[PDB]
Structures are given as structure tokens and as C-alpha cells.
């Protein structure tokens, strides 16, 4: 038809995307990152419009699409017969295996897909793709588990709820290195294998478009470099991410608390206390003190901003008190106790990236999307300067 220049008057590439498979397509706050979102990015250029991520999910994937909520949708989407029903597919950008995953201690024992059909084996997949119907069709004797969330799924793997999973090889490597009681099962020489590509609409010229770009991208090597980049992606920064976020919102509840009690914004005392019980929290668990303290000074610092902004805004308002005002002792300061264990842990489980200058761009990219940001960007910027600054990117 015209999807070209449906495009070009829209001034927009909608892009669907479910951002619950790393290393393609994964949320890191309020952003979409990953290799199929940088395709996309590059897409959008090419095609000389700006790009709008459209979230959806595996099980409405196909209906969104049909629904007309987006033009084209990717992240780690597998060519599937059903699939071609609907749409066309570019070329493949992506070979790979289907292979297990599963405990190290377990890698003997599900060598085969003769070990894995059986009875008594605990295979869990992800609702409604190509790892669905490949457990259903080649090990039809194994229990089958069916596990909506995938950003989790692989949970049941660590605790010993179900016994593997087999599923892309880019997935076990990835997974394998996230999860360190998982290993991928000979991910090199797989079971059969699948192709990743592009879903688009039913137009052959809009197809002939993305398949000039996407093989330039496949030959140039770009596609294969960006694989690597997203594999070694810091991807276990979200805790920390996360934390610093929840806890930076909480400064609009310390506010609000103490606007109503006429409570002076700093207090250098009681930010002493803070920080040397996040010291002594994190020696616990082998942070050094310095680093401990210019995060925590940063956390405090950013906590003040919102706090004074708000004030600014309720001073010329004139706004009376707060219907809505936890309590300072007794609700707030538990919580934000709470939000300083998980920031230290995060902190501990990362070290290794956050103490590296040359991987600051990275570490950008994790952590960067607060929603916090939205709030103040001023003191989400504070909050994140112990970890990147914003020409870091």
C-alpha cells in the first residue's frame, strides 16, 4: 500500500516492543534500551522521522499489531508460520539455537533431548512463541510449565521450581551470566535453530525499504558488534537504578510532612547519622567508606532539591497543609531505611561496573530514565552523579 508515506505524514515510526527480553528489548525505567531498540533508532533515521516505543506484550503482540497501534514491532520476534499470517517479516538479522538452560549442577543430566523428554522433568517456557512450541512438539513427555512473567521466569530455575528451559541461545548466554547458578547447555551446536527479524505490515516497497537497510547493517558487521555491546550490557544495574528512583519520589511525602510541621528542609545532623549508618551498613558488605559516603551525600542532596522546589512551589501558592502526610518517624524514615539496604546491596552486587571509568556510557545508559527525572531533573541528576554525569550520555 502506502506505509511509507502513511509514515512520513504521521512524522513518526511507532515501534512495538514488549521490554522483557534482554538482551533486545528491556525497560530500564522509562526507557526502552537493547539491540532491537537501537535498531529501531537507526530505522527511524533512515527513514528520516523520529521513533515512538509502543509497549506491548507477547500474548497481544499479534491483536496490537492488527489493532493498528504500531507500524512495525521487534525485540528478539522469531519468524513463526503464525506470525506470517499476519504481517511480513525483513530478512533475518539473527540465526541462533534453541538449547537449554539450566542449574550447573543439572548441565550433565539435559545434555540431550532424549534426557529431557521424559516424565519427572519440569520444563518451563514463555507464553505463546517459538520456545512454547518447540517444548510442546519436541519434548511432548516432560511437564510443561507456562509462566506469564519472562523478566522472572528463569527465577524458577535458581530455587529448583522447575528443572530448565530451552529457548534462544543468545538467552541462555545471557542468563548464564546474570544468574550464576544457571549455565547454558552447549549453546554453539543446538538443538535446530530460529531467526529473529523485523515484524512489518503487508507492504512490499515498505519491506524492499527495510531490507536495503537491514542487510547494509547485517554486512557492515554493525549487527554482530551490537550483539556483543548488548551481551556485555550492564543489565543488573535495574536494582540500583530502581532504588535510587523510589527513593528520591519518597522526598515528595518528607515534604509534604513536614511543610505541615513547619520542618526546616536540612538538618546536618541528623544527614551525619544517615550517612554513617550507610557506612557501617555497607563495610558489612565490603563497600569502602568513601564511595558510601559520596553516593549517600548525593541521595541527601537530591532528597533536599525536591524538597525545596516543592516548598517554592507551595510558598507562592500559598497551599495550606497536606490531607496526605505520612508520618516523618514512623512511616517515612522505615522506608527510606528500607530503600538505603536495597541501594548498598545493588551497590555490592555491581561493584565490579561501577568502579570501571571506561564504562560510564553504559552505566549512563542503565540508570539514567528516573522517574524521579519528571519530578525534578536537577535532583535526579544529583542523585545519579556518584555514577555518571549527563556527558556520560
Given at each position: 500500500d502506502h506505509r511509507l508515506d502513511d509514515i512520513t505524514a504521521r512524522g513518526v515510526l511507532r515501534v512495538g516492543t514488549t521490554g522483557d527480553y534482554k538482551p533486545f528489548s528491556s525497560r530500564a525505567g522509562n526507557d526502552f534500551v537493547g539491540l532491537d531498540i537501537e535498531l529501531a533508532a537507526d530505522l527511524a533515521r533512515t527513514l528520516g522521522v523520529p521513533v515512538q516505543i509502543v509497549p506491548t506484550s507477547w500474548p497481544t503482540l499479534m491483536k496490537d499489531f492488527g489493532d493498528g497501534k504500531f507500524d512495525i514491532a521487534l525485540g528478539g520476534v522469531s519468524i513463526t508460520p503464525e506470525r506470517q499470517k499476519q504481517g511480513l517479516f525483513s530478512v533475518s538479522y539473527l540465526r541462533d539455537g534453541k538449547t537449554p538452560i539450566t542449574r550447573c549442577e543439572n548441565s550433565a543430566r539435559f545434555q540431550t533431548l532424549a534426557q529431557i523428554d521424559q516424565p519427572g522433568v519440569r520444563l518451563v517456557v514463555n507464553p505463546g512463541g517459538t520456545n512454547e512450541r518447540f517444548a510442546r512438539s519436541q519434548a511432548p513427555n516432560a511437564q510443561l510449565t507456562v509462566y506469564p512473567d519472562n523478566v522472572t521466569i528463569f527465577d524458577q530455575i535458581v530455587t529448583g521450581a522447575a528443572d530448565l528451559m530451552i529457548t534462544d541461545a543468545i538467552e541462555t548466554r545471557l542468563q548464564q551470566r546474570l544468574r550464576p547458578q544457571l549455565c547454558a547447555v552447549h549453546p554453539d551446536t543446538p538443538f535446530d535453530f530460529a531467526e529473529k527479524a523485523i515484524l512489518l505490515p503487508r507492504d512490499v516497497a515498505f519491506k524492499a525499504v527495510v531490507d536495503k537497510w537491514l542487510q547494509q547493517r547485517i554486512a557492515s558487521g554493525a549487527v554482530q558488534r551490537s550483539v556483543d555491546r548488548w551481551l556485555d550490557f550492564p543489565w543488573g544495574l535495574e536494582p540500583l537504578r530502581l532504588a535510587i528512583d523510589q527513593r528520591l519520589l519518597l522526598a515528595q511525602a518528607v515534604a509534604r510532612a513536614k511543610w505541615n510541621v513547619q520542618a526546616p528542609i536540612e538538618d546536618l545532623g541528623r544527614e551525619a547519622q544517615v550517612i554513617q549508618a550507610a557506612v557501617k551498613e555497607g563495610a558489612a558488605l565490603g563497600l569502602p567508606k568513601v564511595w558510601i559516603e559520596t553516593v549517600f551525600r548525593a541521595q541527601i542532596e537530591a532528597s533536599k532539591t525536591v524538597q525545596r522546589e516543592l516548598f517554592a512551589q507551595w510558598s507562592a501558592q500559598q497551599a495550606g497543609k497536606f490531607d496526605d502526610a505520612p508520618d516523618?518517624?514512623?512511616?517515612?524514615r522505615p522506608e527510606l531505611d528500607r530503600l538505603t539496604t536495597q541501594l548498598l546491596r545493588s551497590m555490592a552486587s555491581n561493584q565490579t561496573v561501577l568502579n570501571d571509568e571506561a564504562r560510564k556510557a553504559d552505566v549512563a545508559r542503565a540508570m539514567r530514565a528516573l522517574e524521579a527525572r519528571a519530578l525534578s531533573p536537577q535532583a535526579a541528576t544529583q542523585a545519579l552523579a556518584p555514577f555518571f554525569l549527563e556527558h556520560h550520555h
Amino acid at each position: 500500500d502506502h506505509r511509507l508515506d502513511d509514515i512520513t505524514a504521521r512524522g513518526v515510526l511507532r515501534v512495538g516492543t514488549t521490554g522483557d527480553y534482554k538482551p533486545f528489548s528491556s525497560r530500564a525505567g522509562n526507557d526502552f534500551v537493547g539491540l532491537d531498540i537501537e535498531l529501531a533508532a537507526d530505522l527511524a533515521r533512515t527513514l528520516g522521522v523520529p521513533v515512538q516505543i509502543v509497549p506491548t506484550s507477547w500474548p497481544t503482540l499479534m491483536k496490537d499489531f492488527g489493532d493498528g497501534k504500531f507500524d512495525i514491532a521487534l525485540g528478539g520476534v522469531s519468524i513463526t508460520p503464525e506470525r506470517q499470517k499476519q504481517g511480513l517479516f525483513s530478512v533475518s538479522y539473527l540465526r541462533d539455537g534453541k538449547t537449554p538452560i539450566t542449574r550447573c549442577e543439572n548441565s550433565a543430566r539435559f545434555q540431550t533431548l532424549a534426557q529431557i523428554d521424559q516424565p519427572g522433568v519440569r520444563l518451563v517456557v514463555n507464553p505463546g512463541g517459538t520456545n512454547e512450541r518447540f517444548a510442546r512438539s519436541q519434548a511432548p513427555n516432560a511437564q510443561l510449565t507456562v509462566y506469564p512473567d519472562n523478566v522472572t521466569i528463569f527465577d524458577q530455575i535458581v530455587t529448583g521450581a522447575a528443572d530448565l528451559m530451552i529457548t534462544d541461545a543468545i538467552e541462555t548466554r545471557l542468563q548464564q551470566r546474570l544468574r550464576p547458578q544457571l549455565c547454558a547447555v552447549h549453546p554453539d551446536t543446538p538443538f535446530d535453530f530460529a531467526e529473529k527479524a523485523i515484524l512489518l505490515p503487508r507492504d512490499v516497497a515498505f519491506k524492499a525499504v527495510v531490507d536495503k537497510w537491514l542487510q547494509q547493517r547485517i554486512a557492515s558487521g554493525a549487527v554482530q558488534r551490537s550483539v556483543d555491546r548488548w551481551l556485555d550490557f550492564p543489565w543488573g544495574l535495574e536494582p540500583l537504578r530502581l532504588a535510587i528512583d523510589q527513593r528520591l519520589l519518597l522526598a515528595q511525602a518528607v515534604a509534604r510532612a513536614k511543610w505541615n510541621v513547619q520542618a526546616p528542609i536540612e538538618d546536618l545532623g541528623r544527614e551525619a547519622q544517615v550517612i554513617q549508618a550507610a557506612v557501617k551498613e555497607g563495610a558489612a558488605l565490603g563497600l569502602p567508606k568513601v564511595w558510601i559516603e559520596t553516593v549517600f551525600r548525593a541521595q541527601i542532596e537530591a532528597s533536599k532539591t525536591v524538597q525545596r522546589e516543592l516548598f517554592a512551589q507551595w510558598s507562592a501558592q500559598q497551599a495550606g497543609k497536606f490531607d496526605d502526610a505520612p508520618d516523618l518517624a514512623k512511616t517515612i524514615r522505615p522506608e527510606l531505611d528500607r530503600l538505603t539496604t536495597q541501594l548498598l546491596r545493588s551497590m555490592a552486587s555491581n561493584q565490579t561496573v561501577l568502579n570501571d571509568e571506561a564504562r560510564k556510557a553504559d552505566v549512563a545508559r542503565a540508570m539514567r530514565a528516573l522517574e524521579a527525572r519528571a519530578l525534578s531533573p536537577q535532583a535526579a541528576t544529583q542523585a545519579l552523579a556518584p555514577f555518571f554525569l549527563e556527558h556520560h550520555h
